[PDB]
Amino acid sequence: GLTEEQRMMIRELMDAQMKTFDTTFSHFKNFRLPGVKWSQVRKDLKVSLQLRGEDGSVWNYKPPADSGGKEIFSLLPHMADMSTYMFKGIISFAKVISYFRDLPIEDQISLLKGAAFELCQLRFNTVFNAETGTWECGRLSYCLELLLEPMLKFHYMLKKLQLHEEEYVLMQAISLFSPDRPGVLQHRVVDQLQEQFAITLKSYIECNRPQPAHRFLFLKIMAMLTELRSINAQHTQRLLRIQDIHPFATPLMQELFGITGSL
Ligand SMILES: Cc1cc(C)c(S(=O)(=O)Nc2ccc3c(c2)nc(CCCCCCCNC(=O)C[C@]24C[C@H]5C[C@H](C[C@H](C5)C2)C4)n3Cc2ccccc2)c(C)c1
């Protein structure tokens, strides 16, 4: 019940998502693993981790107790490698989309720098098991050892909406094409592009979501996209704080998060 431009546009986002989202994480390899002001940082920073091997073996990691020291950072190198893997997917996803690639390159970079975290969280939501509190990433699993944390309330509430793959990819596009981000020059171009992604989403819900439970679903999604933006800003600052006292960000994280390499 969509216009043909609207069906074309979903098809292109779904295609880009299919080509760049490793749902089984098969190619996440060569990552690091745990071995064998700071008042804010302890409050900023756990997760247990499991690795299924190709042979049927399992390794399980239970994190340490907080004891006022360098043990709260032990999982960060591994998360840095996972995040970098996701960001590569995110960047590839954007580069595949015609509307993104028709922009000037300064703006592309600025948009990617502005939304990478948000698109990473949106992809992670689709592998979040809300019944076990576990992110199920192929051979890897990350389980939580409550919902006062705003990122984590977001994941539970987004998962409760039982969204389609098409709605997830439209949410990704809206977040990507956000005219309100630092260094965007084609402000109005991007705003009009965003408007078409949002209207396609509203029309998609209208056509395939007639049940009373999906009343106001478009508006619920748009408000979660807005929450996710404020959460993005907040988590950008947690990262910078922890990065300041215990460096951990990979070169790709540095580029995406503003770190220049010069003290
Ligand atoms: C200091 C820091 C900051 C940022 C900004 C990033 S990034 O986006 O570049 N990456 C990333 C990647 C995945 C994330 C994530 C952030 N948050 C989340 C949201 C879920 C957890 C909600 C708790 C709210 C924040 N509780 C923290 O203390 C920050 C954490 C820093 C790292 C990564 C992640 C687990 C653990 C270690 C705590 C979030 N998941 C989902 C997830 C978590 C664990 C395994 C798989 C997937 C990193 C790696 C570190």
CA distance linking residue 84 with residue 109, whole number of Å? 16
Q: Which atom of ligand 1 is nearest to the CA of 256?
A: 9
Q: How was this structure determined?
A: X-ray
Q: Whose CA is nearest to atom 13 of ligand 1?
A: 83
Is the dihedral angle over the CA atoms 250, 76, 28, 253 positive or is it negative? negative
The resolution, in angstroms to one decimal, equals 2.5
Residue 13, SS3? Answer: helix
Considering all CA atoms of the chain, what is the largest pairwise distance in Å, rounded to the nearest integer?
59
Q: Indicate whether residue 25 lines ligand 1 (CB < 6 A).
A: no
Query: By the 8 A CB rule, do 200 and 2 touch?
Result: yes
Q: Indicate whether residue 161 lines ligand 1 (CB < 6 A).
A: no
Query: By the 8 A CB rule, do 186 and 136 touch?
Result: no
- Which residues are bridge partners to 48 per DSSP? 143
Q: Indicate whether residue 66 lines ligand 1 (CB < 6 A).
A: no
Distance 72 CA to ligand 1 centre (A): 13
Q: How far is CA 121 from CA 69, 172, 189, in A?
A: 29, 10, 25
The DSSP call for residue 246 is: S
Q: Tell which one of 82, 85, 121, 235 to mutate to probe ligand 1, the residue whose CB is within 8 A of the most ligand atoms.
A: 235
The DSSP call for residue 27 is: T
For the chain, domain boundaries: 1-263
Alpha helix ranges (H) inside 21-149 = 38-44, 76-96, 98-101, 105-125
Query: By the 8 A CB rule, do 79 and 45 touch?
Result: no
Q: Indicate whether residue 80 lines ligand 1 (CB < 6 A).
A: yes
User: Do the bridges between strand 58-61 and strand 128-129 make them parallel or antiparallel, or are there none, so unpaired?
Assistant: unpaired
Which value, to the nearest 10 degrees, does the dihedral of the CA atoms of residues 167, 155, 48, 77 take? 70
From 88, 79, 115, select the one nearest 193 (Cα to Cα). 115
From 168, 20, 167, select the one nearest 96 (Cα to Cα). 20
CA distance linking residue 37 with residue 68, whole number of Å? 13
